[PDB]
Amino acid sequence: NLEELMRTGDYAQITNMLLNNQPVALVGALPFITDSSVISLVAKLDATV
Amino acid sequence: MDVLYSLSKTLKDARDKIVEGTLYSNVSDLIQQFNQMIITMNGNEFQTGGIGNLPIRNWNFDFGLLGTTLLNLDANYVETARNTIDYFVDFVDNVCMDEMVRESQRNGIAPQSDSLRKLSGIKFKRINFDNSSEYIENWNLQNRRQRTGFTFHKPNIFPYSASFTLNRSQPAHDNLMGTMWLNAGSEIQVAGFDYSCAINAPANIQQFEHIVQLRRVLTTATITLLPDAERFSFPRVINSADGATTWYFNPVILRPNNVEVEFLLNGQIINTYQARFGTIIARNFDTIRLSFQLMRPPNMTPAVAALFPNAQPFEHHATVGLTLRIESAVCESVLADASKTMLANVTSVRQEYAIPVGPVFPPGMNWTDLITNYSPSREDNLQRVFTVASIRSMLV
Amino acid sequence: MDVLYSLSKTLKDARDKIVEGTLYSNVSDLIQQFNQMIITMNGNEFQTGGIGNLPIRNWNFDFGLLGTTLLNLDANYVETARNTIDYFVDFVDNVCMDEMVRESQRNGIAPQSDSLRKLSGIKFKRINFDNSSEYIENWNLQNRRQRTGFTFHKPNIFPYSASFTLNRSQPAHDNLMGTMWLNAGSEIQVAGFDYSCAINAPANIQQFEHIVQLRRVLTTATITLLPDAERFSFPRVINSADGATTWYFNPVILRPNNVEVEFLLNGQIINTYQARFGTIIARNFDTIRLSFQLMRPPNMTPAVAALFPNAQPFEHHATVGLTLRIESAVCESVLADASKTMLANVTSVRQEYAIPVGPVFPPGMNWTDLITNYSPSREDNLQRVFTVASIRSMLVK
Amino acid sequence: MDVLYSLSKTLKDARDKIVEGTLYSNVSDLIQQFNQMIITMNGNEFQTGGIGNLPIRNWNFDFGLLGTTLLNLDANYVETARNTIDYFVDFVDNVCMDEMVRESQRNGIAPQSDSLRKLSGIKFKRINFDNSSEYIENWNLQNRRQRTGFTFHKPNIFPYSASFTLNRSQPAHDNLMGTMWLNAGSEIQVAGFDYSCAINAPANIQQFEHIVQLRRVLTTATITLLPDAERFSFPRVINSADGATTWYFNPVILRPNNVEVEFLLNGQIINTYQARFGTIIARNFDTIRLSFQLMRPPNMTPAVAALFPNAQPFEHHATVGLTLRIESAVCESVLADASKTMLANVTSVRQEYAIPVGPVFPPGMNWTDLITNYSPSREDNLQRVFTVASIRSMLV
Amino acid sequence: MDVLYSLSKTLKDARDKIVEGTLYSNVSDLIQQFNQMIITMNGNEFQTGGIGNLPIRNWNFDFGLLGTTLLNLDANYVETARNTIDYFVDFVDNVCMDEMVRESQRNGIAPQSDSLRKLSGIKFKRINFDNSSEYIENWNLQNRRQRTGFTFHKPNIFPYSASFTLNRSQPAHDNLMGTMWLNAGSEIQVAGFDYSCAINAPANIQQFEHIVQLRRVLTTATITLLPDAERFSFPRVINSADGATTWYFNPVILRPNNVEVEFLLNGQIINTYQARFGTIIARNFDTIRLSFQLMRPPNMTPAVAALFPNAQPFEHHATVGLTLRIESAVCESVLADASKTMLANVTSVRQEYAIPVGPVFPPGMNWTDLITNYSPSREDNLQRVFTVASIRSMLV
Amino acid sequence: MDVLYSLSKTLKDARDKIVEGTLYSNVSDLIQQFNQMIITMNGNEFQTGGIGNLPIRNWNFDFGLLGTTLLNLDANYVETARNTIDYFVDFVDNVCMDEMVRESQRNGIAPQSDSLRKLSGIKFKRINFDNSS
Ligand SMILES: [Cl-]
Ligand SMILES: [Zn+2]
Ligand SMILES: [Zn+2]
Ligand SMILES: [Zn+2]
Ligand SMILES: [Zn+2]
Ligand SMILES: [Zn+2]
Ligand SMILES: [Zn+2]
Incomplete structure (x- = not known):
């Protein structure tokens, strides 16, 4: 839960999962970028955010 | 093993200390250790079972960390923690059961289950913390080749043997001289009988000697000596040595004479007790030598003299007993005893899931056969399963 | 109960850890727990004991907090802490004694004394901290209705019964066939006797059976089985069943034949041991069946043949024994055992203050009566009083 | 003693908790206590031994502190800690052994070895921390003059005595009336015998009494009482009181009549049980009175009537037995029991180094003599050495 | 079980309260609970099992919420609600049936069907609301370790047994003295018969005693006691104990004498009624002891004196009877009774789908065998299935 | 014991040396010790027990200091000192009697009566002075 992560300030679990490439689901109202570029998909820019 | 023990002890401390209304300061270190365990275990896939009737179980860890409270824990915190604790406890119990049912002639001290083998990896060493139980302490000492010690109340050191x-x-x-003994558990009961009551023996003394070779060295042992062996003080019909025939025993009990208990280590006399009964201390020994004598009473009342004629037939046979009881002791190796449940736990787990007989332990984990042939490989395997059994006992 | 246990645990930790010269870092969490206890108990009145000869004690709590500015504990700090600890320990002892002498037919697991009832309020739940003792752990598991477990060395599971x-x-x-047994504590000594030594038996085999029904289920039980029963292997003069006369028992011991120990749960075979002697494991059972045979030795030496004639009179009577000893076991219900003092403590407190017989327990806490009729209400009350006894033993003992 | 126990406890916690991969949060307080111990012990010279064959050993303490900036402990930290831990453990073991082998009459509670006397200084109280063990707890209660308590499983309270x-x-x-008993450890087997089967007794009843005085008061005692004394239920030839001759005992067992076991304190009846067998509770007592009766069976079958004639000779001798076993108890004084090992440890240390017999304890640490004459000075010295033995058992 | 009951109660309330023309204020909270249930169940896949002939069924939930903005409910609202209610009722009934046909030995009180196990998860705890029915209330209290009891009209506590x-x-x-009895359901009829009519009995009184040991403790029991057992008051031809032959019974009914009915708990007389007939109250008991006496009438008219001669043949056999009917009672455990339909529902569901015999219940859910061996595992499984049966009865 | 002995010694010295007409230089150190004893004992409540027929006695200490500033002790000084000394001597005698009648099998060298156990605290160590007997 991104709200709980924001409120606690403890980023140990999220940091450990992102460093170790552990599949996760971040839940919360999020703005998103609509990308229509196929080259962006090939470049895998969605995994760099 | 250390990581499995640490998981079990973290879960035990979580169950004991994470209780409603407790100050967060009473659990701060415990909560940090628990969250470290959650971090280390998350994302790891484990499998247990697949042996005998033990079901195959797959374990996944996708738990969030335990939170914090300003002053005291509330009910919500306890329930949220208890869900995770329950899952982890189920996992730990299953891992312990998987490890307890396995054995190896080669490297019997090493983990045998896939889950415990995975838990021995470097990544999980983070979970390791306080190792204060007796069995885990001895495990760590043995891994370092330090002197181990297990304290047993009434150690099960003598394989059952009722022989003569x-x-x-x-x-x-009808004219027999010999000894009959029972070596059962932590008890020796010996009795030397002479049918002629040492009428023709030199100096009217008949010497009886019993030797018990303990399969492991016992140290700091408290032993009770009693003059009489009640088990062999009543008439009984005993099979022959080859089973062809039965003979008759009709004891009349006399005080054992010149009683001598020698506790020996590697053939060297360590402790000697002469005509001493009650509590004695055997500091370090692997052999017990009980030497006693039937001394014909030089003076007899008419009733007594009636029982012991100069010649045959002998109807009342003079018996001198001796009872030895190891109340407590220390052994460098693991043994069954009346105070612990490790052997019972391992045997129960093996019987419940119908584990086929392996190449190390005897069928059914029978203690008599196990202690009779207590090989170093059997010792390693039994220490491993006993340590896992204690780890499981922390939670189950 | 958890609050009372937490009080006792805090006081024991204070006695053990608040010592002169110790680093404050060794006790900081303990000092916080102690001050939490002082704050929670301050301003509260308690009353303990109006049953039997137990005196009415009134308890007031107005104590200052222990300091936290020190780096190493000194003498004066320890003495003030000891004064507060002594008062609190006396209060906890009296509360435990008051709770141990009371029983209820309805909610025996619930608190009975008014002091423990008051401690069961929300405001005192703050005192609750580490519940690590075996009895309190089982209490908490039973409250949530999880699988409880009590480990007993030599469990007292068999009520005394010496019968035949x-x-x-x-x-x-003068021509008797039967069995005599003693079931006492954790021991069963049984013996089958035939006065004719199975001379006219069907193939010279006499079958003896003994069924012992435990009042609670035992698990993970280590059991020693020995072939002979020394208790029934000497001459005896035994009253008849009606007590009209007395008969003579002159046993000669023969080894038992086809020994079979069966450990059953709900009339279903869990464990079976055949001709096995020494240490055995009964993993889960509530009934024991010992079946053993007296087999006439086909070949006898002249003395043995003289023992057993072809017809009466039978001066020597063939006997085959069995001894069973539960060394250790696990039971989901509380029990008296050789190692613990819970039953002894409860009985001692009840006898000391002359507590009248209640509607739950036998007249005098007699264990044979209790285990003979170990009802669920008796189980609840016994678990409650045993847990309180352990809590008290943490401090008074 | 408190300082020695604190040293041992700190070392044991260092062994258990300073392990590879553990969070520093799990050991921070322990590391602080360990460094405090190093600081307090540094610059101090100690000397142990010099008694019996115990060698003289000199101990110098110049040690560096452990690090405190780690997040998780690694191999280097563990080895650095373990060197100091090994030296300190050897020092504590030698101090404990030196103290276990010494005794004083007037002030036996106070430390005897020079090392422990030096450790009893004010400056060493900084080492002092958690005193949670039963024996150190009772030691501190005794030093404060509070009520003490030791729980014993099968307390060894009865000195060995087989008499009649x-x-x-x-x-x-040939016409004997009396009673024979064995008192041993926590066991009392008594048996009253009448050769005439109380045919000439007033009401055909023979009254037997047995009073056993305990050398210390036992409280919260659980006892098992049984109606037969197997020890005196078989035929035996027994020496005479003066040893001049021997007599014949041929028991035939009848159930005891009007059994009454009384537990007395200072001559006042605290507990009383009539015709009660199984488990009983003696809440507080120092004496046991077992009074039983042999009642002649008014109705006898022809065999039973054949056993007991109207006049001599009396070939079958009526016997009624009682068995009393203290399974658990609480005593304000230290005693040897089946579950603990302090007596065994002290005796082993005294034997291994050939400690000459002192002015307090009996030779060889024999328990029967010690408990027969359990004087206050002996109690002081025994409590001291038992506490030292427990402290040593924490490490060795 | 709480979530399943909440689903059933929500559906029952929806059926009862969502009726055309009703004010929305009459259903506002009900509609809120129904929408909460829809939200919690939406997106979840469930499977009700294929045990026996019960078909495997799959359940999906993608329902929309109910309106909340009308002043009065109309036909469209009722139809829209009914479309969802039918599906939810079918799902709940199938889950209840799947749970009713399953049993376990280790944990018979825990859910057995995978659907109920899924519903026991935290995510479904939102569905839980008012738990007011007796069975669910007892379930919740018993999960809280709180004293709770079921009230039974004519409890089926006595296993069927017609014996003598x-x-x-x-x-x-032809000269028989004994007792006949039928213990069936909530009824006991007993009759002591003497063929000689106590002609040669001490004081011309024959004592009969009948003990019925209840398998569970009953409390606040209203009991009708009557002085005659009509079941054993007419001529009979009765098989012998071994069935070898048949004997003749020709009762002549006399008033029972010294009628003492004791209701005992743990062997202690809780209630006693002497010569009392009609309504009596047994407040708490587990055993019923009926003692009565056949008293030969001291004075007999010539017709009466002809029935009872001084010796054989005895053609009229004097019988005294008692009848004990438990009209109402309270039991900690669940029981079959004449008022409730739990046993009938469970048996019907198990019979209709050819559920094989399991390891807990007897074949065909036979109540005599069930209550004869009412083991704790049987009690747990029976309470579980009975609660599920009540939950289903709320809808089916 | 050393505190009790010091109380007795101070009282005996006061009785022997605080006499009418004596130079203050003959008692200066004695007066200092006596005032130290008064300060240490002031505000403390003692109880001599009721073992046997020994009466239960309660002792309260609220005494002014002995004066300085006299070249030779006069009668008023000696009277005030005698009042204080009489009360203190009664207390010390009762404490000694209470201690003399008690015993313990173990730790019999330690104080038995509550008064002497209280006197064994650190705060009373100030009273301790010359131990010559
Ligand atoms: Cl034992
Ligand atoms: Zn032979
Ligand atoms: Zn034991
Ligand atoms: Zn008979
Ligand atoms: Zn003699
Ligand atoms: Zn009706
Ligand atoms: Zn018949």
Whole structure:
């Protein structure tokens, strides 16, 4: 839960999962970028955010 | 093993300390250790079972960390923690059961289950913390080749054996001299009998000797000596040595004479007790030598003299007993005892899931056969399963 | 209960850890727990003991907090802490004694004394901290209705019973066949006797059976089985069943034949041991069946043959024994055992203050009566009083 | 003692908790206590031994502190800690052994070895921390003059004594009335015998009494009482009281009548049980009175009537037995029991180094002599050495 | 179980309260609970199992919420609600049936069907609301370790048994003294018969005693006691104990004498009624002891004196009877009774789908075998299935 | 014991040395010790027990200091000192009697009566002075 992560300030679990490439689901109202570029998909820019 | 023990102890501390209304300061270190365990275990896939009737179970860890409270824990915190604790406890119990049912002739001290083998990896060493139980302490010492010590109340050191030896006998079994003994658990009960009551023995003394070779060295042992062996003080019909015939025993009990208990280590006399009964201390020994004598009473009342004629037939047979009871001791190796449940736990787990007989332990984990042939490989495997059994006992 | 246990645990930790010269870092969490206890108990009145000879004690709490500015504990700090600890320990002892002497037919697991009832309020739940003792852990598991477990060394599971059964008899009591047993504590000594030594038996085999029904299920039980029963291997003069006369028992011990120990749960075979002696494991059972045979030795030496004639009179009577000893076991219910003092403590407190017989427990806390009729209400009350006894033993003992 | 126990406890916690991969949060307080111990012990010279064959050993303490900036402990930290831990453990073991082998009459509670006397200084109290063990807890209670308590499983309270008394006797020993008993550890087997089967008794009843005085008061005692004394239920030839001759005992067992076991404190009846067998509770007592009766069976079958004639000879002798076993108890004084090992440890240390017999304890640390004459000075010295033995058992 | 009951109660309330023309204020909270249930169940896949002939069924939930903005409910609202209610009722009924046909030995109180196990998850705890029915209330109280009881009208506590005991008998069965009884359901009929009419009995009184040991403790029990057992008051031809022959019974009914009915708990007399008939109250008991006496009438008219001669043949046999009917009671455990339909529902569901015999219940859910061996595992499974059966009865 | 002995010694010295007409230089150190004893004992409540027929006695200490500033002790000084000394001597005698009648099998060298156990605290160590007997 991104709200709980924001409120606690403890980023140990999220940091450990992102460093170790552990599949996760971040839940919360999020703005998103609509990308229509196929080259962006090939470049895998969605995994760099 | 250390990581599995640490998981179990973290879960035990979580169950004991994470209780409603407790100050967060009473659990701060415990909560940090628990969250470290959650971080280390998350994302790891484990499998247990697949042996006998133990079901195959797959374990996944996708738990969030335990939170914090300003002053005291509330009910919500306890329930949220208890869900995770329950899952982890189920996992730990299953891992312990998987490890307890396995054995190896080669490297019997090493983990045998896939889950415990995975838990021995470097990544999980983070979970390791306080190792204060007796079994885990001895495990760590043994891994370092340090002197181990297990304290047993009434150690199960003597394999069951009810046997006799006839030093003088003949096919009619009416004039017999010998010894009959029971070595069961932590108890020795020996009795030397002479049918002629040492009428023709030199100086009217008949010497009886019993030797018990302990399969492991016992140290700091408290032992109770009693003059009489009640188990062999009543008349009984005993099979022959070859089972062809039965003979008759009709004890009349006399005080054992010149009693001598020698506790020996590697053939060297360590402790000697002469005509001493009650509590004695055997500091370090692997052999017990009980030497006693039937001394014919030089003076007898008419009733007593009636029982012991100058010649045959002998109807009342003079018996001198001796009872030895190891109340407590210390052994460098693991043994069954009346105070612990490790053997019972391992045997129960093996019986419940119908584990086929392996190449290390005897069928059914029978203690008599196990202690009779207590090989170093058997010792390693039994220490491993006993340590896992204690780890499981922390939670189950 | 958890609040009372937490009080006792805090006081024991204070006695053990608040010592002169110790680093404040060794006790900081303990000092916080102690001050939490002081704050929670301050301003509260308690009353303990209006049953039997137990005196009415009134308890007031107005104590200052322990300091936290020190780096190493000194003498004066320890003495003030000891004064507060002594008062609190006396209060906890009296509360435990008051709770141990009371029983309820309805909610025996619930608190009975008014002091423990008051401690069961929300405001005192703050005192609750580490519940690590075996009895309190089992209490908490049972409250949530999880699988409880109590480990007993030599569990007292068999009520005392020294009796006999005659399968063959007649008024002269000179040709008897039957069994005599003692079931006491954790021990069963049984012995089957035949006065004729199975001379006219079907193939010279006499079958003896003994069924012992435990009042609670035992798990993970280590059991020693020995072939002989020394208790029934000497001459005896035994009253008849009606007490009209006395008969003579002159046993000669023969080894038992086809020994079979069966450990059953709900009339279903869990464990079976055949001709096995020494240490055995009964993993889960509530009934024991010992079946053993007296087999006439086909070949006898002249003395043995003289023992057993072809017909009466039978001067020597063949006997085959068995001894069973539960060394250790696990039971989901509380029990008296050789190692613990819970039953002894409860009985001692009840006798000391002359507590009248209640509607739950037998007249005098007699364990044979209790285990003979170990009802669920008796189980609840016994678990409650045993847990309180352990809590008290943490401090008073 | 408190300082020595604190040293041992700190070392044991260092062994258990300073392990590879553990969070520094799990050991921070322990590391602080360990460094405090190093600081307090540094610059101090100690000397142990010099008694019996215990070698003289000199101990110097110049050690560096452990690090405190780690997040998780690694191999280097563990080895650095373990060197100091090994030296300190050896020092503590030697101090404990030196203290266990010494005794004083007037002030036996106070430290005897020079090392422990030096450790009893004010400056060493900084080492002092958690005193949670039962023996150190009782030591601190005794030092504060509070009520003390030790729980014993099967307390060894009865010195060994197999004796008899003949209330009716003749030189031929054919019409004997009396009682024979064994008191051993936590066991009392008594058996009253009448050779005439109380045919001439007033009401055909023979009254037997046995009073056993305990050398210390036992409280919260759980006892098992059984109606037969197997020890005296078989035929035996027994020496005479003066040893001049021997007599014949041929028991036939009848159930005891009007059994009454009384537990007394200072001559006042605290507990009483009539015709009660199984588990009983003696809440507080120092004496046991077992009074039983042999009642002649008014109705006898022809065999039973054949056993007991109207007059001599009496070939079958009526016997009624009682068995009393203290399974658990609480005593304000230290005692040897089946579950603990302090007596064994002290005796082993005294034996291994050939400690000359002192002015307090009996030779060889024999328990029967010690408990027979359990004087206050002996109690002081025994409590001291038992506490030292427990402290040593924490490490060795 | 709480979530399943909440689903059933929500559906029952929806059926009862969502009716055309009703004010929305009459259903506002009900509609809120129904929408909460829809939200919690939406997106979840469920499977009700294929045990026996019960078909495998799959359940999906993608329902929309109900309106909340009308002043009064109309036909469209009722139809829209009914479309969802039918599906939810079918799902709940199938889950209840799947749970009712399953049993376990280790944990019979825990859910057995995978659907109910899924519903026991935290995510479904939102569905839980008012738990007011007796069975769910008892379930919740028993999960809280709180004293709770079920009230039964004519409890089925006595296993069926029509038997007799002959204290005096002979191969010809013409002078018999004994007792006959039927213990069936909530009813006990007993009758002591003497063929000689106590002609040669001490004081011309024959004592009969009948003990019925209840398998569970009953409390606040209203009981009708009547002085005659009509079941054993007419001529009968009765098989012998071994079935070898048949004997003749020709009762002549006399008033029972010294009628003492004791209701005992743990062997202690809780309630006693002497010569009392009609309504009596047994407040708490587990055993019923009926003692009565056949008293030979001291004075007999010539017709009466002809029935009871001084010796054989005895053609009229004097019988005294008692009848004990438990009209109402309270039991900690669940029981079959004449008022409730739990046993009937469970048996019907198990019979209709050919559920094989399991390891807990007897074949066909036979109540006599069930209550004869009412083991704790049987009690747990029976309470579980009975609660599920009540939940289903709320809808089916 | 050393505190009790010091109380007795101070009282005996006061009785022997605080006499009418004596130079203050003959008692200066004695007066200092006596005032130290008064300060240490002031505000402390003692109880001599009721073992046997020994009466239960309660002792309260609220005494002014002995004066300085006299060249030779006069009668008023000696009277005030005698009042204080009489009360203190009664207390010390009762404490000694209470201690003399008690015993313990173990730790019999330690104080038995509550008064002497209280006197064994650190705060009373100030009273301790010359131990010459
Ligand atoms: Cl034991
Ligand atoms: Zn032979
Ligand atoms: Zn034991
Ligand atoms: Zn009989
Ligand atoms: Zn003699
Ligand atoms: Zn009706
Ligand atoms: Zn018949």
